[PDB]
Design an enzyme around this catalytic site. Structure first.
Site, PDB file in Angstrom:
ATOM      1  N   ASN B  24      26.038  19.544  19.628  1.00  0.00           N
ATOM      2  CA  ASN B  24      25.974  20.923  19.185  1.00  0.00           C
ATOM      3  C   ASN B  24      25.485  20.876  17.739  1.00  0.00           C
ATOM      4  O   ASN B  24      25.314  19.793  17.177  1.00  0.00           O
ATOM      5  CB  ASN B  24      27.367  21.563  19.282  1.00  0.00           C
ATOM      6  CG  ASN B  24      28.340  21.005  18.261  1.00  0.00           C
ATOM      7  OD1 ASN B  24      28.335  19.806  17.966  1.00  0.00           O
ATOM      8  ND2 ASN B  24      29.191  21.873  17.720  1.00  0.00           N
ATOM      9  N   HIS B  35      17.139  21.336  11.709  1.00  0.00           N
ATOM     10  CA  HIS B  35      17.714  20.216  12.423  1.00  0.00           C
ATOM     11  C   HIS B  35      17.898  18.943  11.597  1.00  0.00           C
ATOM     12  O   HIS B  35      17.017  18.535  10.836  1.00  0.00           O
ATOM     13  CB  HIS B  35      16.867  19.949  13.670  1.00  0.00           C
ATOM     14  CG  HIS B  35      16.882  21.082  14.653  1.00  0.00           C
ATOM     15  ND1 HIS B  35      17.784  21.154  15.692  1.00  0.00           N
ATOM     16  CD2 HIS B  35      16.152  22.222  14.711  1.00  0.00           C
ATOM     17  CE1 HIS B  35      17.610  22.287  16.348  1.00  0.00           C
ATOM     18  NE2 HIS B  35      16.625  22.954  15.772  1.00  0.00           N
TER      19      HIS B  35
HETATM   20 MG   LIG Z   1      19.055  18.016  18.490  1.00  0.00          MG
END
Ligand SMILES: [Mg+2]
Ligand SMILES: [Cl-]
Ligand SMILES: [Cl-]
Ligand SMILES: [Cl-]
Ligand SMILES: [Mg+2]
Ligand SMILES: [Mg+2]
Ligand SMILES: [Mg+2]
Ligand SMILES: [Mg+2]
Ligand code: NA
Lengths: 79, 216
Positions: B24, B35
């Site tokens: 998650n 990210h």
């Molecule tokens: Mg990822």
């Protein structure tokens, strides 16, 4: 051609095995190593049983065989 | 909004070679909206050290990965929260359904699981199989009803105990690159090939600590 497995040992006792072609310039090995270790090409020197490895040396030229060890040292003090 | 309510937009498109899948969104990732933002993560460093990226990138470049590198991102569960290794079976299972749905839609060549933990969860809640003797690297099973491969790598989080440094994990990013090239028929330079990486855990931890102390 033929290939051999070489073990590259660092001062942190990390040991990296590479399958290398007998007739290829070790420059590729040194380059691959430096990049995967995250350090500049000029920050390390590679030795094979006392002999520093030049960019245009090949395993065959150095008389290397299966399982031979290459030791890597820093050109400068710890980071 | 309060941090635990935030989500992280995934980065997916069609024709991707790789999709990085985590459990998650991490706290910093959810907070910044990108990210794997370091320094508590080794993803970007490993991405460059393995040659997957041409230059050293950072989390703010995540949007460029699909187009320039054929790489995308998503996670098992969209909800942000620490201790995600122990979420409820039901939440994981539902997240798994949604994830498989996205993978069956975009059809990336390789679903890359960021850590054995997430692949173990995925196998349990999606395949209904508690994997035994899970090895890193390629798995024999594909994403349900697709040709998408499953590849497992060491967790990129600095919290990973088995591998303290980026260099202790990069081996699998290199192997992933080699696999990727193979799938695309990209000429592989077989002059040099890394086949194994072993190291001393304690010296690695100490090394990771020192570098972490050096303020640039
Ligand atoms: Mg990822
Ligand atoms: Cl919160
Ligand atoms: Cl970053
Ligand atoms: Cl792992
Ligand atoms: Mg020769
Ligand atoms: Mg020559
Ligand atoms: Mg000899
Ligand atoms: Mg490694
Ligand atoms: Na040289």
């Amino acid at each position: 051609g033929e290939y051999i497995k070489l073990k590259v040992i660092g001062q942190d006792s990390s040991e990296i095995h590479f399958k290398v072609k007998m007739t290829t310039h070790l420059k590729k090995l040194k380059e691959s190593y430096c990049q995967r270790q995250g350090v500049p090409m000029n920050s390390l020197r590679f030795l094979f049983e006392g002999q520093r490895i030049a960019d245009n040396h090949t395993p065959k030229e150095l008389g290397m065989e299966e399982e031979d060890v290459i030791e890597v040292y820093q050109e400068q003090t710890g980071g | 909004a309060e941090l635990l309510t935030k989500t992280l937009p995934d980065i997916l498109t069609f024709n991707l070679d790789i999709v990085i899948i985590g459990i998650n969104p991490g706290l910093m990732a959810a907070y910044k909206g990108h990210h794997y933002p370091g320094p508590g993560n080794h993803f970007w460093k490993c991405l460059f050290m393995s040659g997957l990226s041409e230059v050293q990138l950072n989390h703010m470049d995540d949007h460029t990965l699909p187009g320039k590198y054929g790489i995308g991102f998503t996670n098992m569960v969209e909800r942000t929260t620490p201790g995600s290794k122990d979420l409820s079976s039901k939440e994981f299972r539902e997240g798994g359904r949604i994830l498989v749905q996205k993978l069956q839609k975009y059809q990336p060549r390789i679903a890359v699981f960021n850590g054995k933990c997430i692949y173990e969860i995925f196998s349990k809640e999606v395949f209904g199989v508690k994997v035994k003797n899970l090895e890193f690297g390629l798995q024999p099973h594909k994403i349900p009803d697709t040709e998408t491969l499953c590849y497992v790598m060491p967790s990129s989080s600095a919290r990973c105990a088995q591998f303290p440094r980026a260099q202790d994990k990069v081996h699998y990013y290199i192997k992933l690159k080699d696999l990727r090239d193979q799938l695309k028929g990209i000429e592989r330079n077989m002059d040099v090939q890394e086949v194994q990486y072993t190291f001393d855990l304690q010296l690695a931890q100490e090394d990771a600590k020192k570098m972490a102390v050096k303020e640039e």
